[PDB]
């Protein structure tokens, strides 16, 4: 529809030559004026829509287009008359009054009729930015009679849609201009202002308003004052966070100085009779100031002043202090629970991230605080921290951190149980997000231990407690926690590969996992939408009508994660997924969890079988056609393992059949399948059966069966050794190592006996 | 033509191939037309039952042999179109690489028609790979390698240095550090003749970009004219690492070229050292 003026004119003249009647010409005049507007021909569009209206006084869209063209040109009176006659013809239009108001505002001659029309539109609709701008332009040249209506409209819009940052800013500015601080304080005291905290200028205006209110009412200490101080501190922390997120150094330093000044000012009331929500928010802001000083040091190192090798230790000490900040205490007089809970969750998140960063940076330490206390008694440490942060501008007494020391807070050490508790407390308010999950997975991989994603997903999804019925079939209803764990492991592996590729250089290395203000999102919008749709479909939060669309959006990305053709990841990564699933399903000893694991593995194998056949035939590889990153051949599968992968799929089938309740059938299937992993599983099953027989009775038939099983296991180990010595391609995919195979064969031979052995 | 081919096909083989095959090959290479005789093409479609196809079979093998004869003679675009009609991604990518390899050695700036021909051939190959099954794993790897290499080549020829530097750093295939030289050598053993031959021009362009960057860094003041001393030291250290990795690669790979290329390699090694 939008092309070149020459093409538009050619299409117009072709349609005119095809039209053989003025009636049909005026009928097509609608599309004629549309193309004229797309090609920027206002006069021709106007004459076309005028002819169309003259030959047919129907369709309000044509009247709206004519009014818009008149507003673009300069026929305000004609547009007003056309809108009036259109409203008189059909009084079933709501945007016509807004169009009339826009025309009058463009004319710059406001009218009482337009004011009444906009008032009726505002009484009808709950609120709109268009009607807000219309009322602003109308009453911007009236007086107090219009100011009252504007304030009423702003209040109605704020009651309708609370997400009105610019509207709230304009209201606060109007209140400050008209000298009305009580209404501004009452508006800022709302709980939704915490979520509205998104603009640095809005946060600074809120901070100034709160400071003015405190300077005006200095002399009262009530729950309202506590809430106002907490909101002021939260706005200051948001300002500092925004300055640290954006690329600068002087602004972040000024924000940290303002935060330290506010903390020093509030320390006067901290030491008073305030020992509840005020002290809670004071400790919260102390931890936030520590983390913000660490982020400012990191930003300065990025802007190149002091290297990471010299700025990690101050950042590590700041993180340790933020972690040692005492937990939010209880309040004897309740009243601000909505803020106390938010402060407690913020403390949980801060403690979690500080402990994780300190553990990843220290690899085990706890005597640093004791050594500092025994040597410098924290005084010289705080002096060095102040000299590294604020240089020599602020003195030792002009800051709350100079008078306080490390002994002022707690002396707890980051432990695994405390870290897990803080992570659970963070998740209970995050409601499930892949970013922090990938971060925790990376932290666990750096600490060299398996991450407990099972309990995390169980507490995230209240509908799937590791108990599902649908296993096969590529359907969105068969979604369990295993697919989410696979996606999280994929994102973790991608982030680890990116970090390894970035660290392989002579550039000054950075600490593992950069903080949030200096680490953008690594996932994609498609993956985020798929995760959100999966969460909404599992938590039964869908709408009656959009369920099919949500299922289709989910399947659009699930067709790749379910190990099917046209991938976005890597075949080697899919093979690793299948191997890990099989290992987790074969090493445990439960029932439902193992069955679900092996069912998901069986589904993955039976869906990947075509890709295995393609790799065997040596054809196309997963080309980067889907927005799922891009890798290379270093993490790709080979061509000498397709038979091993098919045999592993058969092994998963046999294990599923065994756990279902067909031990003999699964043993027969394992014996029929020829694979080193199959023979190893057969030997393990035979050893377990021998242990069970030795624990129970030993009849003649059971003894003969045990002897036959031991002989079969010995023969399977011998043929495994023969195949490993002959075919070299089987060595590329080996389950247990050769030493483990040899020790298992030796144990089997020792349990059986000599002579009869081979 | 088909009426005469109906009589020419009655003769059996005579001293290799056949007189009928030689005649039809000469006729098709003299005519250069197949949109209705062999099959029409929208952009990368399959074959259509043409006039000769409606009477004789083995049309796929006939078209493959004709395209092979044309490639052996000296035809590129028509042979590529014929193989795209016959649906052969392996041969399509093979001829694409064979026609883009000799042009890599010379300049790649828009000065004639060879660059436009290689660009349209690369576009046809990439759209054929997107719509349908591509070639083998090694063939697709070589195709992506050549795509990235010609991209870096045109980025360097356009007059930009930072763009070439960042694309050659994001390629993740040049020797980065000493711990990466091992995997680079391990992956070098699974390359190809073209991938081993174009390394000369690749290293030449890399050393040209590195020398330009070093000259700009030397012209820029250490303390004045921007670029702080810490940034200069970091750049010098990353150049040291890159040079050490490149020289370790070139020293421990089982392949030697020429004295001039070796001298230039050591020259860039010590320049960044």
From Swiss-Prot, chain B:
Locations listed in the record: Nucleus membrane; Nucleus, Nuclear pore complex
Highest taxon of source: Eukaryota
The family this protein is said to belong to: Belongs to the nucleoporin interacting component (NIC) family.
Function statement: Plays a role in the nuclear pore complex (NPC) assembly and/or maintenance.
Identification of the protein by name: Nuclear pore complex protein Nup93
The organism's taxonomic lineage, starting at the top: Eukaryota, Metazoa, Chordata, Craniata, Vertebrata
Name of the gene this protein is made from: nup93
Full-protein interval shown: 548 to 820 of 820
């Amino acid at each position: 529809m939008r092309r070149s003026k020459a093409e538009i004119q050619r299409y117009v003249e072709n349609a005119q030559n095809s039209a053989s009647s003025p009636r049909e010409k005026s009928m097509k005049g609608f599309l004629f004026a549309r193309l004229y507007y797309e090609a920027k021909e206002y006069e021709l569009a106007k004459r076309s829509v005028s002819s169309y209206i003259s030959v047919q006084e129907r369709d309000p869209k044509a009247h709206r287009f004519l009014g818009q063209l008149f507003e673009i040109e300069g026929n305000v009176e004609k547009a007003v008359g056309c809108y009036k006659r259109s409203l008189e013809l059909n009084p079933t239009q709501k945007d016509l009054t807004l169009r009339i108001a826009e025309l009058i505002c463009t004319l710059n001659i406001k009218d009482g009729r337009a004011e009444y029309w906009v008032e009726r539109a505002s009484k009808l609709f709950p609120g709109s930015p268009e009607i807000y701008r219309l009322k602003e332009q109308l009453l911007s040249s009236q007086g107090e009679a219009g100011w009252n209506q504007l304030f009423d409209l702003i209040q109605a819009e704020l009651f309708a849609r609370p997400n009105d940052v610019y509207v709230n800013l304009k209201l606060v500015d109007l209140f400050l201009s008209n000298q009305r601080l009580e209404e501004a304080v009452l508006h800022c005291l709302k709980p939704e202002r915490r979520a509205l905290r998104t603009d640095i200028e809005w946060c600074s205006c809120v901070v100034r308003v709160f400071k003015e209110y405190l300077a005006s009412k200095q002399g009262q200490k009530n729950t309202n004052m506590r809430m106002i101080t907490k909101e002021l501190l939260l706005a200051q922390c948001d300002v500092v966070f925004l300055t640290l997120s954006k690329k600068d150094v002087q602004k972040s330093k000024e924000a940290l100085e303002r935060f330290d000044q506010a903390l020093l000012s509030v320390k006067q009331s901290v030491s008073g009779t305030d020992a509840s929500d005020l002290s809670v928010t004071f400790y919260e802001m102390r931890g936030h100031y520590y983390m913000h000083a660490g982020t400012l040091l990191l930003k300065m190192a990025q802007s190149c002043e002091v290297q990471w090798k010299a700025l990690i230790e101050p950042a590590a000490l700041c993180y340790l202090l933020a972690y040692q900040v005492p937990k939010p205490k209880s309040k004897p007089v309740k009243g601000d629970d909505n803020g106390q809970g938010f402060l407690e969750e913020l403390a949980f998140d801060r403690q979690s991230k500080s402990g994780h960063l300190l553990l990843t940076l220290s690899h085990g330490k706890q005597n640093f605080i004791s050594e500092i206390i025994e040597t410098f008694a924290n005084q010289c440490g705080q002096s060095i921290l102040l000299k590294f942060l604020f240089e020599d501008n602020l003195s030792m007494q002009d800051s709350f951190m100079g008078s306080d020391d490390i002994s002022y807070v707690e002396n707890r050490v980051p432990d695994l149980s405390e870290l897990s508790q803080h992570d659970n407390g963070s998740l209970r308010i995050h409601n499930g997000d892949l970013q922090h999950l990938t971060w925790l997975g990376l932290q666990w991989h750096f600490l060299s231990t398996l991450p407990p994603l099972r309990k995390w997903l169980k507490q995230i999804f209240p509908r799937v407690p590791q108990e599902t019925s649908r296993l096969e079939s590529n359907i969105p209803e068969s979604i369990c926690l295993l697919d989410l764990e696979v996606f999280l492991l994929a994102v973790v592996q991608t982030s680890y590969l990116q970090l390894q590729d970035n660290n392989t250089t002579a550039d000054p290395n950075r600490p593992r996992c950069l903080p949030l203000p200096i680490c953008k999102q690594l996932f994609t919008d498609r993956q985020r939408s798929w995760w959100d749709a999966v969460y909404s479909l599992i938590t039964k939060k869908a709408l009656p009508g959009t369920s099919a669309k949500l299922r289709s959006v989910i399947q659009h990305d699930l067709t790749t994660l379910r190990a099917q053709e046209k991938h976005g990841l890597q075949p080697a990564v899919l093979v690793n997924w299948a191997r890990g699933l099989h290992k987790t399903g074969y090493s445990l000893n439960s029932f439902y969890d193992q069955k679900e694991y092996m069912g998901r593995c069986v589904h993955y194998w039976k869906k990947l079988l075509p890709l295995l056949d393609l790799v065997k035939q040596k054809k196309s590889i997963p080309e980067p056609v889907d927005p799922l990153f891009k890798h290379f051949h270093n993490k790709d599968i080979k061509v000498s393992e397709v038979k091993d992968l098919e045999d592993e799929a058969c092994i998963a089938f046999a294990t599923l059949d065994l756990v279902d309740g067909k031990t003999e059938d699964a043993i027969i299937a394992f014996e029929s399948v020829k694979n080193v992993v199959a023979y190893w599983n057969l030997a393990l099953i035979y050893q377990r059966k021998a242990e069970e027989i030795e624990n129970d009775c030993l009849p003649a038939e059971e003894q003969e069966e045990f002897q036959e099983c031991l002989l079969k296991c010995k023969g399977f180990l011998k043929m495994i050794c023969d195949e490993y010595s002959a075919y070299p391609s089987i060595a590329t995919s080996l389950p247990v190592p050769v030493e483990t195979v040899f020790e298992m064969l030796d144990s089997v031979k020792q349990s059986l006996g000599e002579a009869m052995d081979d | 033509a088909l009426q005469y081919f109906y009589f020419l096909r009655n003769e059996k083989d005579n001293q290799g191939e056949s007189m009928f095959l030689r005649c039809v090959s000469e006729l098709v290479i003299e005519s250069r037309e197949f949109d209705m005789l062999l099959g029409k093409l929208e952009k990368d479609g399959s074959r259509k039952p043409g006039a000769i196809d409606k009477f004789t079979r083995d049309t796929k093998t006939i078209i493959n042999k004709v395209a092979s004869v044309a490639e052996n003679k000296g035809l590129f675009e028509e042979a590529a179109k014929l193989y795209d009609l016959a649906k052969n991604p392996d041969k399509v990518l093979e001829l694409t690489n064979k026609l883009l390899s000799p042009v890599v050695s010379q300049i790649s700036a828009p000065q004639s028609n060879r660059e436009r021909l290689k660009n349209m051939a690369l576009a046809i190959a990439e759209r054929y790979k997107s719509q349908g099954v591509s070639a083998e794993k090694s063939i697709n790897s070589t195709f992506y390698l050549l795509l990235d290499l010609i991209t870096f080549f045109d980025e360097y020829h356009a007059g930009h240095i930072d763009l070439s530097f960042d694309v050659i750093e994001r390629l993740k295939l040049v020797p980065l550090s000493q711990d990466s030289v091992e995997e680079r050598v391990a992956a070098f053993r699974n390359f190809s003749d073209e991938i081993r031959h174009n390394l000369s021009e690749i290293l030449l362009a890399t050393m040209n970009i590195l020398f330009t960057q070093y000259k700009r860094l030397k012209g820029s003041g250490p303390t004045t004219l921007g670029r702080p001393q810490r940034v200069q030291e970091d750049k010098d250290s990353v150049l040291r690492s890159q040079a050490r990795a490149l020289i370790t690669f070139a020293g421990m790979i089982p392949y030697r070229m020429s004295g001039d290329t070796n001298a230039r390699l050591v020259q860039m090694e010590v320049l960044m050292n």
